């Protein structure tokens, strides 16, 4: 029993964290085999950030301008190349601690663990989700750029995020490990603002099924709804539209608890209308949207209480 | 910016997790040097049950390697299995006993394999609100101070309300619990006042000031009010401990106590603090300072 926001064990990722220095800028890099991946803005000054021409800044650099430090050991840079918004530093030593890994690009609503690092040293691990507006609500201070997001289903680490910047509202933006930004963001100090955020409906539904599995049913009702009527109501509370894919994805949790997806939708509609009335669901007074259907199946027991 | 429930990086602890099997029971063990520590209920008068076991009855597995048990002894509610191989991944460590209100990271394991890491606090009623399933026994709680791992908790059991109970690494239970199937219940819990205050300072640091007011209270008047909402008493030590956060924000501890009093008697009025509609008590003053400064390990 119990339901916590749980992160993946961070060991396989800790053994890949390095410090990258270029001039006066110091940030984090990910050392996999003989390559160190880091945000390309490490080559910029704060002045450059308004309208940087990365190709022009990079051509002026030599391998010995990039200082890479793995623990107390200096790695020698033997090559460099840019791929989208990520700099790839070829080093003379392969990381002996390189785990089995893949680079995966995630979709909004997907969750992942973040290993927050400063000066190539890990300080903490937390769980978070890619918001529908392509930002993440993280906990990052200056020097955290280059920190990575990942999942470790089975023994393979799936890297899905690298931290690049903080937006004026305090939310965070970054790229996949191929350097493509999530959202319409640029690694430029331009007027950039996160779009209006919405609640991840399929995740709230999954968390309501997790509550039923852990023994709580106070929020259920005798009503059902059509998918269209549910979406007309949900959009009014800034909830993401629920698609037939989401309904299909919630199938296993529906069969385990005996509550049809559109019946759980009717209960969600009622929660939005009435609030919680001094009650909590899984120790929370708000409807939680940072647990996917896959996370619920992984954390909860297979026997409904 | 940002304020998340953050756990310590778990790598140094992952390299110590092993699987311990005795008869039909399989649970987790902590392998430090040539000793494997695990709940003594794996042998299930524990000395009478233990005397009947031989070294070869305990099957210990570290990854895909079988460790040979060469000795065994009991210390309170923990079994210590002497093995023939020292763990090459043993980190710098200490066994520390924590106090209620203190927080720690839990590396949840099943079959000697780590599956997740989360942060939690020792409740005033000595239980923890964790997330564990069958097979999680032997999972450990820890803090990291510089490069040294301080092991503070080993999981033993789940109580009827879904909360968890366990021991320090010397086998002494936290709380009035015993390791056996009997009628045991967690006592009435209370809110960790010094932690709620620390989290209110974290909100001010992150730009949330709607709850601040011009008022201040005495420590005695604050405790008379707090006792009525099942909040732990606030001591002069707690006030002293909150000193650094008070100096950083410019809000005196008794000034923040007056804001907490208004929140208890009036609620949040449809508002949130750090994305929460409840007053959060699982961040210590040290956790707030560490996360709002970036200390590394
Ligand atoms: O935002 C930046 C650097 C930057 C500036 C302009 C554009 C780009 Cl792509 C990157 N660094 C930070 C990251 N996360 C969190 C922070 N918190 C405070 C200060 C700085 C932080
Ligand atoms: Cl995805």
């Amino acid at each position: 029993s119990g339901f916590r926001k749980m992160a993946f064990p961070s060991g396989k990722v800790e053994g890949c964290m390095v410090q990258v220095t270029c001039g006066t800028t110091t940030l984090n890099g990910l050392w996999l085999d003989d390559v160190v991946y880091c945000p390309r803005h490490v080559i910029c000054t704060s002045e450059d950030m308004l309208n940087p021409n990365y190709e022009d800044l990079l051509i002026r650099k030599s391998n010995h301008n990039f200082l890479v430090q793995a623990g107390n050991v200096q790695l020698r840079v033997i090559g460099h190349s840019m791929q989208n918004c990520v700099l790839k530093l070829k080093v003379d030593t392969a990381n002996p601690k390189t785990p089995k890994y893949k680079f995966v690009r995630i979709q909004p609503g997907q969750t992942f663990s973040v290993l927050a690092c400063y000066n190539g040293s890990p300080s903490g691990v937390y769980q978070c989700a890619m918001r529908p507006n392509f930002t993440i609500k993280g906990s990052f201070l200056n020097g955290s750029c280059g920190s990575v997001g990942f999942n470790i289903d089975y023994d393979c680490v799936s890297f899905c995020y690298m931290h690049h910047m903080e937006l004026p509202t305090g939310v965070h933006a970054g790229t996949d490990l191929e350097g493509n930004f999530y959202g319409p963001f640029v690694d430029r100090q331009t007027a950039q603002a996160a779009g209006t955020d919405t609640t991840i409906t399929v995740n709230v539904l999954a968390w309501l099924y997790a509550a039923v599995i852990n023994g709580d049913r106070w929020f259920l009702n005798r009503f059902t709804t059509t998918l269209n009527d549910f979406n007309l109501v949900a959009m009014k509370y800034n909830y993401e539209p629920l698609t037939q894919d989401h309904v299909d994805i919630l199938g296993p949790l529906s069969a385990q608890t005996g509550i049809a997806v559109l019946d759980m939708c009717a209960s969600l509609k009622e929660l939005l209308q009435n609030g919680m009335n001094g009650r909590t669901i899984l120790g929370s007074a708000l409807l939680e949207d940072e647990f996917t259907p896959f996370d619920v199946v992984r954390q909860c027991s297979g026997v409904t209480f």
Side-chain angles (χ1 to χ4, degrees), chain A:
Chain A
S1 175
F3 207 72
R4 282 273 187 188
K5 192 148 285 182
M6 196 172 294
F8 281 99
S10 62
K12 286 166 170 52
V13 179
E14 295 168 47
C16 304
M17 305 310 308
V18 298
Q19 183 197 68
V20 180
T21 300
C22 197
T24 176
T25 308
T26 285
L27 44 69
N28 310 286
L30 187 67
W31 181 29
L32 294 170
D33 300 312
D34 59 349
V35 178
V36 171
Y37 302 80
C38 73
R40 74 179 173 171
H41 69 70
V42 68
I43 74 189
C44 300
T45 75
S46 294
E47 178 191 11
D48 280 316
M49 292 307 303
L50 284 168
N51 294 292
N53 191 302
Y54 290 99
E55 291 87 11
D56 191 64
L57 293 177
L58 194 56
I59 198 77
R60 310 179 188 266
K61 300 250 140 189
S62 68
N63 295 329
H64 58 280
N65 292 143
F66 298 100
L67 310 175
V68 178
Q69 205 180 314
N72 277 117
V73 181
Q74 201 73 20
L75 301 179
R76 197 170 66 91
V77 175
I78 60 161
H80 61 265
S81 73
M82 181 167 57
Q83 176 184 8
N84 304 310
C85 302
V86 293
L87 182 59
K88 298 190 285 188
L89 301 177
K90 199 67 160 171
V91 293
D92 209 42
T93 303
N95 189 357
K97 300 180 185 168
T98 305
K100 278 198 62 121
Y101 78 94
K102 302 171 194 185
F103 285 170
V104 175
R105 184 174 175 88
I106 62 167
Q107 297 299 313
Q110 186 60 268
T111 66
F112 56 101
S113 300
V114 170
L115 181 63
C117 300
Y118 299 90
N119 299 295
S121 304
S123 53
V125 63
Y126 57 88
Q127 190 71 1
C128 69
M130 177 60 58
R131 300 306 308 172
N133 71 356
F134 300 97
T135 70
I136 74 171
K137 292 173 172 181
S139 182
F140 291 120
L141 305 176
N142 188 35
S144 68
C145 298
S147 293
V148 297
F150 65 96
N151 285 289
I152 309 175
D153 312 288
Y154 316 113
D155 225 43
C156 178
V157 180
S158 34
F159 293 106
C160 63
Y161 177 86
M162 173 171 281
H163 187 53
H164 277 66
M165 63 194 204
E166 187 174 288
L167 297 172
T169 51
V171 297
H172 307 100
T175 70
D176 56 29
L177 268 291
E178 294 184 282
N180 294 116
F181 260 94
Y182 286 101
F185 307 113
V186 291
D187 48 1
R188 226 181 124 202
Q189 182 58 229
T190 222
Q192 302 196 79
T196 64
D197 203 26
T198 49
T199 301
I200 311 158
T201 313
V202 65
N203 286 7
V204 174
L205 290 167
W207 170 86
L208 288 178
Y209 279 114
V212 174
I213 288 168
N214 282 257
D216 212 353
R217 306 174 45 106
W218 67 259
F219 46 86
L220 302 177
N221 64 25
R222 65 186 221 274
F223 305 106
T224 194
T225 185
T226 70
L227 184 61
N228 203 45
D229 283 352
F230 173 78
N231 286 328
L232 284 173
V233 170
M235 263 75 130
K236 286 167 205 190
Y237 294 93
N238 270 35
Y239 265 59
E240 274 295 288
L242 193 76
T243 67
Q244 184 55 217
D245 271 10
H246 295 145
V247 175
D248 291 349
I249 286 166
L250 290 159
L253 287 170
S254 171
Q256 184 187 336
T257 67
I259 302 164
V261 174
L262 292 173
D263 290 1
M264 192 62 96
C265 285
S267 162
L268 178 53
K269 276 164 78 182
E270 185 170 277
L271 277 163
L272 293 171
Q273 169 189 274
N274 297 342
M276 296 210 196
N277 205 6
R279 286 169 298 201
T280 60
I281 294 167
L282 291 174
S284 176
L286 291 178
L287 300 178
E288 179 68 56
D289 74 347
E290 300 211 345
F291 294 102
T292 69
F294 190 94
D295 293 344
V296 171
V297 163
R298 194 167 194 274
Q299 171 164 197
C300 297
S301 178
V303 183
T304 306
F305 175 57

